[PDB]
Each structure stands twice: as C-alpha cells, then as structure tokens.
A paper describes a structure:
Here, we show that the juxtamembrane (JM) segment enhances RET catalytic domain activity through Y687. Structure-function analyses identified interactions between the JM hinge, αC helix, and an unconventional activation-loop serine phosphorylation site that engages the HRD motif and promotes phospho-tyrosine conformational accessibility and regulatory spine assembly.
Both crystal structures contained the PP1 tyrosine kinase inhibitor in the nucleotide-binding pocket, had an ordered proximal portion of the RET JM segment, and had a hyper-phosphorylated status with four sites phosphorylated (Y809, Y905, S909, and Y928). In the crystal structures presented in this study, phospho-S909 displaces phospho-Y905 and adopts an approximate equivalent position by engaging activation segment residues R897 and R912, as well as R873 from the HRD motif instead. The JM-KD structure revealed contacts from a short segment of the proximal JM region (residues D707 to W717) with a hydrophobic patch composed of residues from different structural elements including β4 (L790), β5 (L800, L801, L802), and αC helix (L769, L772, L773, F776, L779). Examination of the crystal structure revealed that in RET the R-spine is composed of four hydrophobic residues originating from the αF helix connecting N- and C-lobes; these residues include H872 (from the catalytic HRD motif), F893 (from the DFG motif), L779 (αC helix), and L790 (β-4 strand). W717 caps from the top the R-spine in a linear tetrad compatible with an active DFG in conformation of the kinase.
Author numbering:
A (entry chain A), B (entry chain A): 710 to 819, 845 to 1011
The structure:
Amino acid sequence: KILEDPKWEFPRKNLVLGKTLGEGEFGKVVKATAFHLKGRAGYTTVAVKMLKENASPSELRDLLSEFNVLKQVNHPHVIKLYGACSQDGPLLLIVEYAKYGSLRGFLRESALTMGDLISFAWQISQGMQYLAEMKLVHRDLAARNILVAEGRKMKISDFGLSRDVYEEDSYVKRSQGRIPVKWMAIESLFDHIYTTQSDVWSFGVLLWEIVTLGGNPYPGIPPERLFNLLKTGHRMERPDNCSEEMYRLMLQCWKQEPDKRPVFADISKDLEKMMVK
Amino acid sequence: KILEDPKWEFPRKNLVLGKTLGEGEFGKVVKATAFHLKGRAGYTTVAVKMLKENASPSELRDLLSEFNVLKQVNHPHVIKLYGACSQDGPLLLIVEYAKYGSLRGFLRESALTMGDLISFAWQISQGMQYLAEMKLVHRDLAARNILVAEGRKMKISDFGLSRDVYEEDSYVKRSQGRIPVKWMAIESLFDHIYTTQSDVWSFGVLLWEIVTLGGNPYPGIPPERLFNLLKTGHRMERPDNCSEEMYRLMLQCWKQEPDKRPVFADISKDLEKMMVK
Ligand SMILES: Cc1ccc(-c2nn(C(C)(C)C)c3ncnc(N)c23)cc1
Ligand SMILES: Cc1ccc(-c2nn(C(C)(C)C)c3ncnc(N)c23)cc1
C-alpha cells in the first residue's frame, strides 16, 4: 500500500527496462528507456531502481525513504528523480542515469590528474552544501554512494538512510547500526548522533577515498578497533597522492568537536582555492 | 570490546586464510586451514567468516548473534562452530567448511533425482526439529541460508537473526524488517510474530525452492503485493516436479492458523514416507 503522487507517477507501458546495472544491499538497478518523460516528446535513457526478489520490509522502507527525499531536492550534483511506477505491479523508481557508474568503481577502474580529483570533491561539496541548506543529513556519505553521470559529473545518491535536520515527525522508528563504522563520525559512533557536521566527518573520509582512487579507509584496521582509535585521538595518516593543504582539510573534517569542523560552504571555497592554484 | 570465551578461542598464528568463498550482506567468508584444532594433531580445512571493510554496527551484532547461537547447538545438519579469534585484531569465526556451497547455488548449478531432493528436505527438517527442541526460532529459513558440505549433506547456517523460543533477556533491542517478505509467515508479516510454527511456514517455501532447483518463490509477484495475496488465502501453485503428496505438505506449512501447521517432528516422518515409497 503505497501512496501514488500524481506529480511523479509514470506509466509503466511507457517504460522499457533493459540490462541489470547492479544488484546488492542497495536493491536492483537496471538500465532503461522512458518515452514521453516530463511531457517532452521522444525517449530518454534513464535508470530504474526496484526491490529484489528477496526484499525485506526494511528494504522497502529505504526505497520509500529514498523516494521521499528525491521528490524534494534538485541539484546538478544530486541525482535527479524523474518518475515512479507505484500502481499495477512492482514499485519502480525512475531517476537520472549515470553512465560511468559509482564513484568507488570509477576511481578503481582508472587516467586522472590531481585536478580531476579536486573537481570531484568540489562537486560533492557543492551538492552537500545544498543538502545542508535543504535541512538534510545524508549519513551514508561515502565513495560507493556517489554516482558518475556523463561528463564525469558527480551525483550524490542513496538517500535511504538520510534524515531531516529538524525531525518533523511525531514518532519515527529509529534505524540502528546501518552506517559503516569507518565512515561514522565519532559522536555518531559514541552516542548515535548524526548531524551536518557528522557528514563533514564522513566527507573527510570521502576525500581520503578519492585521493587514493577508491582506497579502503583505515587499511588493515578491524572496524571493531576503530572506536578505540578515534577515542584516543588517532586519525588516518597522510596518503601518497596528497598535498600538505589537502591532508589538512581531512583532519579539519575529523576534529573531535563538531563545531570545530568546517561547513560545506567553507569546503567548497577551500577546494576551489586548490583548483585555481 | 568482545568477550573472549576460552572454550572457543583459537590462536590466529595457527590459522592460515585462503581465497574468498563469498561476500555480501552476510559478511566475508574465506576458505582457510586451521592446525591443531580441538587438540587434534595436524591441520583441518575450515571456513572463516569475518566482517567486511565497510561493516556497520548491526553487521557486528549479527556476527556476535551468530556466534552465540553456534556455541550452543550441535547437529550433523547444523553447521558446526570450531573456534574464534576475538583478540589481537579482527574478529574471525572458524566453522565447518561446506565444499559444495550454498543450497540455492547447488540446486541452480545442476544431475539430481527426486529422491535426492526429498533427502535434502529430510535433513533440513531433522536439524530444524532439533533447533525447535533447543528452543530456537530461525526466522531466516531459506535455500540461500543452507549450506552443502561434502557428501551433499545439508547444513543449516546463518543464525544472525535467530531468536530464543523463550525470551531470556530483560531488554532486547528488536531487529526490524530483515526477513525477506516471500519467506515471512503471514502472522510475522502481519504482527511481527516469529515462532517455530512460523519457521514451518518458511520451511514450506524452502520445499518449493528445492523442488524447483533454486526457484524464485512467487515468480513475477512483487513482494509488496504478497501481503494482500496471503491475507486473501492465496498461496503458491503446484510446480512442475511436485507430487500430489509433496505439494500437500507445502500447503499444510502455509495454513493460516499456526496451530494448524505441522511440527518439524511430523515433517521428518512425512518426508521419510516419501523416501521409502
Ligand atoms: C534511486 C536510485 C536509482 C538508481 C541508482 C543507481 N545505482 N547504480 C549502481 C548501483 C548500478 C551504481 C547506478 N548506476 C547508474 N545510474 C544510476 N541511477 C544508478 C541509485 C539510486
Ligand atoms: C558462521 C558462518 C561461517 C561461514 C559461513 C559460510 N558462508 N558460505 C558462503 C556464503 C560462501 C556460501 C560458505 N561456504 C562454505 N562453507 C561455509 N562455512 C560458508 C556461514 C556461517
């Protein structure tokens, strides 16, 4: 029983699904083509996300949660929602198509200069600054949760775990322990507290992933040992393809006090100062 | 911070990990060899389960939950726990090794006669009757959660979501919506009620998977539409490789009233009557 919003409902007969682009804990995403989308004559190459054959109740809640947050945002660096098919069969979410795939895969498949990586971090920081202005916390901010559309333009994705900056619900059942530990902020890891400043912590780990072309954060460190490491003040070390100014930004994102961490508005200007220089 | 039980702690220096056997929502399972296990001189081919590099707090809780339930059971058709490495690094669970892999994959890879399939259902019903005697509900009973060791002997696995038949804890934080809908009992789907009779419902779906050699239950039916179908009394249809007596057993497992469903003790005798005849 899903409410069908007419502003986003799309006819299933006007949608042809193609080959599977990926399947896992996120769901089932297939490539597809949608004709007469948004009233524009012709067809459009899109991406359709659906539940798996072995989906659980929580898997639907995330797809509906992802559906809600995508109806409310709009940004050239946040994946765009085009339509949905909530009636007469399976639930399909029709969104923008990212040719080059997820960012974690795109970085691993690599020729990219250091200017290309700072551009990626700049785009992600731009969209995140917008989400902060939209009163949203992403929580699940990582390299795997970022898409790469055509033009190598970064697109923020996976809003199934996102919450409001101001809780606008009388009773919200709390999701528990669904954020990977190595991307969790120390206060989120210690008291289940997720904020925009916690996304900055997650963004700092994202910077580490980009400068390493899809590296595994805290290498060889069991995630069950990371709480003790972060509680004592230990962070990650300087990687190989990192400058003195770039590594300083990661540590500012990893400051213990969330007030001592920069906001995404400052991160965008800090990263542009690296692009110009 | 994990408590190290000396009855199950095993030295990491006495364990060599090999190639990865599988990775996903369940965790990371690698093939390995353990020397001087259980005091027996020599080495033993085992399987080691560990957390992923992007594991979340709940992923650890399941591994610890799976660890607890495996310390307490023993059956030739339930996977056997051999040891663990909870100190000085990553958390490793050392259990029995299943050469032929998961049951869902083993059925799909297939020459098997109808007698071979009833034998598999018999073995799974035997171990489940034992778990019911051990006051345990498995909940996540499916074909993917069953292993096939050497000799094509069935081994019940994945106890991360298992609960006690009698709740022996003052405050237990409830996991929510982690069982795939198509395997959920109608009362579990309607009021979050998981019991041994609900495992019989799940076992009936497992029978359907075996007689179809790893088929997808309720084919072409969106899992969001299954609650309405089961609430109106509709079940699955007779498959192709199913007898009149075998299909009757599935429907008895799918009876609305859980008291109207058979117990695993009767299922073992019902399946043996098919093996003899
Ligand atoms: C709502 C929604 C829908 C689809 C996706 C998505 N996942 N993925 C994979 C997982 C294949 C990289 C994609 N690859 C390309 N384009 C996409 N749009 C996606 C993400 C969110
Ligand atoms: C505690 C525990 C440890 C390992 C496994 C396990 N998963 N898997 C896959 C997923 C590769 C089929 C296995 N394949 C063979 N043998 C095994 N033992 C396993 C299950 C539970």
